[PDB]
Structures are given as C-alpha cells and as structure tokens.
Amino acid sequence: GLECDGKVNICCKKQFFVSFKDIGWNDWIIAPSGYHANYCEGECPSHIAGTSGSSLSFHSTVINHYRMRGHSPFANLKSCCVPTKLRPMSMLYYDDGQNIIKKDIQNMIVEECGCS
Amino acid sequence: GLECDGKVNICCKKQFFVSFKDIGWNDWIIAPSGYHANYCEGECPLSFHSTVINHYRMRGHSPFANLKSCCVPTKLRPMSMLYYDDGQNIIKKDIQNMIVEECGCS
Known part of the structure; x- marks a missing residue:
C-alpha cells in the first residue's frame, strides 16, 4: 500500500512508535519495552x-x-482509511493466572493501509 | 465480533447474499451461483x-485524538470458485478475501 510522504493527501501508512511506559503498560509487559506499530x-x-x-x-x-450504482445498502456506507494487513509480534508479559508468558500476539504491527 | 440483529447499534456483521446472475457476473463465474459476502x-x-x-486517542494526544474509528472487517475468509480465464479456460482457484467473517473498530 501507499506510505505517506510530502504532498500525499490520500489514505497512507505512517510510522508510530508505541512506548509501553507512556501508556502505563510497562507494569505487566517485560519485552519489548516499545515498538514500531504504525497507523x-x-x-x-x-x-x-x-x-x-x-x-x-x-x-x-x-x-x-453496488456503490458505483448508488444501491442503498452500500451507497450510504462511507470509506475509511484503515489497516488492511497487520502482522504479529513476539511479547513477554505477565498474564492473569499464568504469570510470565512468551507468545506471538496477533495484529500488533500495521503492514498495509487501505480504504474500507 | 457481533452480528447485527436490528437492535444493537455498535459495529456488527450484516449478512448479505450476492447472486452472480443478479449482478451479471454469471457469464464468467461458473460456480458457485452466489454466496454470503456480508459487510x-x-x-x-x-x-x-x-x-x-x-x-493514546483517549489521552487527547494529537495523533489519534482526531482519527475517526470505523467499523470495518477484521477477518475475511477465502472461497473456492470456478471461472473462465482470459483464454476462456476454466480455473478452479481459492479466491482470498471473499467473505467478511468478522467486523470490529479501527
């Protein structure tokens, strides 16, 4: 998909670094302490x-x-720029009942963006 | 996800059946005759x-403070199809991203 850059005005991918300290989750996530999630x-x-x-x-x-023809069901639904492909990420964290777990979590990283 | 039932207002899956005869695609799609594409x-x-x-959005922080959250597919599933090629060759292929299985917010 499209990555954002100077003068791109339509749906595109941008970088976004998630720091778990920031949003307060470093209390239960051991590693990574942050990561490139994108949006x-x-x-x-x-x-x-x-x-x-x-x-x-x-x-x-x-x-x-149906949109092309204005057929009502879909004529009224508006298009949104959203992830259309995500990828998993290995994480190490405390779980309720399990304590320390290592596991690939799905839909962590945005890979490709598109219009709904 | 949720399935729309005419009472719930939050993001849900709507069942939607498409007949390839109705929309005029049955000249190149041989089977099936239609299917639940949903939305x-x-x-x-x-x-x-x-x-x-x-x-982050909730922290009123510029990146996501003003990014709308939208109801969109979170899982799609393939279907098997039989269709004519450019060479008028019958192909049996597993087409991906045919059925909306699950909806959720962005």
Whole structure:
C-alpha cells in the first residue's frame, strides 16, 4: 500500500512508535519495552474506495458494484482509511493466572493501509 | 465480533447474499451461483493494535485524538470458485478475501 510522504493527501501508512511506559503498560509487559506499530491516515475518495493500494479484493469489487450504482445498502456506507494487513509480534508479559508468558500476539504491527 | 440483529447499534456483521446472475457476473463465474459476502456496519464508541491507539486517542494526544474509528472487517475468509480465464479456460482457484467473517473498530 501507499506510505505517506510530502504532498500525499490520500489514505497512507505512517510510522508510530508505541512506548509501553507512556501508556502505563510497562507494569505487566517485560519485552519489548516499545515498538514500531504504525497507523493509517488520509482521505478515501470514491475512486479509491475499497482498495488497498494497487490491489482490489474480490469482496471490495462486490461492494463497489453496488456503490458505483448508488444501491442503498452500500451507497450510504462511507470509506475509511484503515489497516488492511497487520502482522504479529513476539511479547513477554505477565498474564492473569499464568504469570510470565512468551507468545506471538496477533495484529500488533500495521503492514498495509487501505480504504474500507 | 457481533452480528447485527436490528437492535444493537455498535459495529456488527450484516449478512448479505450476492447472486452472480443478479449482478451479471454469471457469464464468467461458473460456480458457485452466489454466496454470503456480508459487510460491516455500526457505531464505534478489540485487536491489540486498535486497543493501543485507543489508549493514546483517549489521552487527547494529537495523533489519534482526531482519527475517526470505523467499523470495518477484521477477518475475511477465502472461497473456492470456478471461472473462465482470459483464454476462456476454466480455473478452479481459492479466491482470498471473499467473505467478511468478522467486523470490529479501527
């Protein structure tokens, strides 16, 4: 998908460093103490609705069939710039009942952004 | 996720069945005849990433203070399909991102 840069005004990926100390979770997360999570931001005009950069899923093609024609169900749903692919991350943390756990947590890192 | 039931207002999955005959795609899609594609709908006042940006947003901190949270698919599933190629060749393929399985807020 698109990464943000000078003069890009549409849905794109930007960096975002999460520090667990900041949001107070360093009390139960041992490692990593912070990480690059990233996020998505930007406009989703109608000519990119439902896309993820250079690709259009089959589901989105079905939806855009109805949007293109103004068919009510989908004519009214607005397009949002959101992650369309995330990736897991290994973490070490205290769990309620288990104490110290090491485990891959899913949907930690935004990999690709797109318009809903 | 939740499934819409006409009473709940927060982000839920709506069932939606698509017939390829109705929308005029049955000239190149051989099977199945249609399927439940479903979609996402409802208010966003569950993934770890969304949770994390939730915290920051709540701290009235510029990055996410003004980023709208939207109801969107959080899981999609593939389907098997049979369709004609550009060569008018029948292909059996597992198409990905065909069915919305789960909805959640960004």
